[PDB]
């Protein structure tokens, strides 16, 4: 069977037979905005993250996912067709597939998303998982609360003796995309500045390389105005040198009070604590110091031990408090989803090709 | 042959060649409220006051005995599979059994419970004794009048030289329970505030700890609303701190006057007096001063020497009066209930499956 | 005199020489977030729930009150500030003044609230009533229970021949903001997305028009997913189009069996069986057919035709059931009020300052 990570930001795919996936890119279709002025094949109509990554400049880049909703579905349908066909060289007709999805999503969103998956692509089975039960599978616990953050989607989930509580799920729109156009709006405080598409991935590689998350922004921010050598040096890909200081944590600490970025809500360490508030009296000694961060946005160094400062300021006193911060956080949701596929008990819970002949696409329901 | 104290609130059972029980769990059946959002074996359609103590939260707690009448009988048939095979590893066809129950109880009570305890576990022996007879075993005595209080039943029986009137009973549907919920309605006057199942585990526990009798409550409400430093603070599982005062002993002293509760009869005192003012004119001398506590909630302390005081301050006097509270009253029913087990004499006594196959269930009268 | 129905949600004032109030504004304090980029007087560092309603956007929104019990005094103070100042014109040491609370509430609250009231405003005599006993002025019984719904307290009193019965009253923290937050939670199924205070009174005026109450849900369900035309359309204040269906039902209905909101009590109907079964059995007969419903949160219609049949099927049949729902609930408490603060007889009630210098706030006991 196949697991295909179809989260946002990127897409991560293989087979539950393995410990990792076979294909990581990232998402994108391309298009060129200019005619083809000397013969050949070498000016495609449409190009697919493997390769429009590569040709931008002559390309604009559009994303088929935002806030992890898709907005328009044949360019996740041509990402499915490369999945398929050209990246795993595998025909869909011949393996069960399982998809994640954010926890709340549009309903419509599954229906689509299946009647695509086995009217065009025809696979024999199917099913939905939401990405946060599939961390813990990952982890192997059975109690504990999920955090996730990946490109513009954040999440929480408890988790207790394997069963959710529903009510007690929040999301929060802030990670990843809506945190580099931060960084690009706060970058043009030294001059540099950043307009079009293919020129933002350049600051997606910068934050993916020069980002740390400040224990003590306040004292951080106290250094880099000093005298202090804090800054680093990057070469653009023309060799223009940038420099960078008073920025490398002043752009992630806005995951923590997105009042920098005028977004009225509270945070990611005050959602957790108002997710576990959420739960019944006797959970809180189990959820707390049961914490597990995945997705990549927390992957910035120092995140861990500002979160557990942060928690451990604001829930009462004399508990214990860890955070499960393992490496791999980023393929943690596709491990999961290859455990799930691979356990024989669960191989009743496909939605097989006779079910959604009776039921239609609701069958998801 | 087994001793089992189905008594309400929790469950003591045990052989008769010991002298306290082997078992002592709360006889809860709690069942969960949530869909399985993770795959495993661990969530049994039920769980016994064992399990059901600790993994309180995810499940709601229904009892299936309540005011000492059984209310659900599948649920007590799966409390006593528990105890026969889980708790005490034991064949029920091999032994006899003798089953307490509170002295006043609807017939078909009996009924039930007997064509259950050997028509379904096939015990080859059964006999159903009334716990206040049991207790003076436990005492030793032959004369004397016994008090009771438990989960949800007080009585009281006079017996002289071994003989009960049974003209001078009396219940008193006021313990235990029915003082917890008001412990729960109290404590709202500080502000925290105790809504559901699981959660009130937590003010039984409280009640448990943080509770004394006072001698003088006019004179302790008096103390408290001074400068006295009398308050006690518990912490809650999740770490919350609880701090009470004058609140300790209001509780308890509901047992008392129970016009608190809106409950318009006499109170535990008051219906000791009226029960020895039954009995014949030469028995007061014999049932003062052979005064034996019994159950659960006369374990609270200073409730010996103000009940003395009580009943003093009432029944006339040049009259000795001395209360007999040994410590083990918790385990006392069933101890004489070992003890009437162990006594060859006895052994005619019990009814046979010969019997039950003439008369059926109603062979119990 | 002045009455002010200082009950959670909105404040609601007036003289007690009137049918209705003269005040009706929805007690929000809100608070700028964005720093003065032009020069003027328009950015008062407090404003009350008169403008800060139209001034929402660039506003928090923080209520002074929350589950009935004041959160920050010092916004109350400032409310009660404009109520007497600035909205009613009315120089507070010139009249007195009485003031609602929900039936149990942290003692202290009473005490600092009277504090205030007259150590503050130096009002000449205070005093404080439960909201359901003034309902019952409004309608003018002397026989009845009352059930009240607001904003997050819902709660019980029986009443007969004028008098209640402190063991029998029930709150039950249900109403209102938590099943806003619920419509919040439900629309997210469409699409539509709202994450914010002042976006939320969006949410709260489209449950205050598009709403009703299904007298058989598991019908209107079944009708809702046919081909049935059932959706209403709101126009957002950007003019945005909302369609709402399969929900206008589904969010007032959580008010019962509120298992939808992971709440694990017992509902409304269920709560108003258990609050007459406290009563004493000739009781009955005479609070059955006299169920008076007050308090915003009872507007939706059809919700009196449900909980009549509810009762029905759950009530001792031969019994007449009959549901008082009046118009005007909205104000009923405060018409109560009016009636009491006008009665002569009472006025020897009053706490007056002579009492309160002996005794200080306590005297409110
Ligand atoms: N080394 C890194 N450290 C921190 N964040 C990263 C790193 N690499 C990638 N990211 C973030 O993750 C995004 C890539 O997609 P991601 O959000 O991880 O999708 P998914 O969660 O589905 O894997 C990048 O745009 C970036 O915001
Ligand atoms: N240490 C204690 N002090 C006072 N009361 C107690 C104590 N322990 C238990 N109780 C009361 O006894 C109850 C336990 O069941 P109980 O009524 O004793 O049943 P039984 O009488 O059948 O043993 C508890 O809910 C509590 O009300
Ligand atoms: N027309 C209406 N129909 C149903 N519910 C309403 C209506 N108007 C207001 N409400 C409910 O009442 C709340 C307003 O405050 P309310 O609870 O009525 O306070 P009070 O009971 O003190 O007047 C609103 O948030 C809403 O939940």
Redesign the interface.
């Given at each position: 069977a196949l697991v295909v990570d179809n989260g946002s930001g990127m897409c991560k795919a293989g087979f539950a037979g393995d410990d990792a996936p076979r294909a990581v890119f990232p998402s994108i279709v391309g298009r060129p905005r200019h005619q083809g002025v000397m013969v050949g094949m070498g000016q495609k109509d449409s190009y697919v993250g493997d390769e429009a990554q590569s040709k931008r400049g002559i390309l604009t880049l559009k994303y088929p996912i935002e806030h992890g909703?898709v907005t328009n579905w044949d360019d996740m349908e041509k990402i499915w067709h490369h999945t398929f066909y050209n990246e795993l060289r595998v025909a869909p007709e011949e393996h069960p597939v399982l998809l994640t999805e954010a926890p709340?999503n549009?309903?419509?969103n599954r229906e689509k998303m299946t009647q695509i998956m086995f009217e065009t692509f025809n696979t024999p089975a199917m099913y939905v998982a939401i990405q946060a039960?599939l961390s813990?599978?990952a982890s192997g616990r059975?109690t504990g609360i999920v955090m996730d953050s990946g490109d513009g989607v954040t999440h929480t989930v408890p988790?207790?003796?394997?069963?959710?509580?529903?009510?007690?799920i929040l999301r929060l729109?802030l990670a990843g995309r809506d945190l580099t156009d931060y960084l690009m709006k706060i970058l043009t405080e030294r001059g540099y500045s950043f307009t079009t598409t293919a020129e933002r991935e350049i600051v997606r590689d910068i934050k993916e390389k020069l980002c740390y998350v400040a224990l003590d922004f306040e004292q951080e921010m106290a250094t880099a105005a000093s005298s202090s050598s804090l800054e680093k040096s990057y070469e653009l890909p023309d060799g223009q040198v940038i420099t960078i200081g008073n920025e490398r944590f002043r752009c992630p600490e806005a995951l923590f009070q997105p009042?920098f970025l005028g977004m009225?809500?509270c945070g990611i360490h005050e959602t957790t604590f108002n997710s576990i508030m959420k739960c019944?009296?006797?959970?809180?000694?189990d959820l707390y110091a049961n914490t597990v961060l995945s997705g990549g946005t927390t992957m910035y160094p120092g995140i861990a031990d500002r979160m557990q400062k942060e928690i451990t300021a604001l829930?009462?006193?004399?508990?214990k408090i860890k955070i499960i911060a393992p490496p791999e956080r980023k393929y943690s949701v596709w491990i999961g989803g290859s455990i799930?596929a691979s356990?024989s008990?669960?191989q009743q819970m496909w939605i097989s090709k006779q079910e959604y002949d009776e039921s239609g696409p609701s069958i998801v329901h």
């Open positions: 909703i709340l549009p309903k419509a039960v813990l599978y059975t988790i207790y003796e394997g069963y959710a509580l529903p009510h007690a729109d009042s009225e809500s019944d009296v006797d959970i809180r000694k829930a009462p006193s004399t508990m799930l356990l008990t669960f």
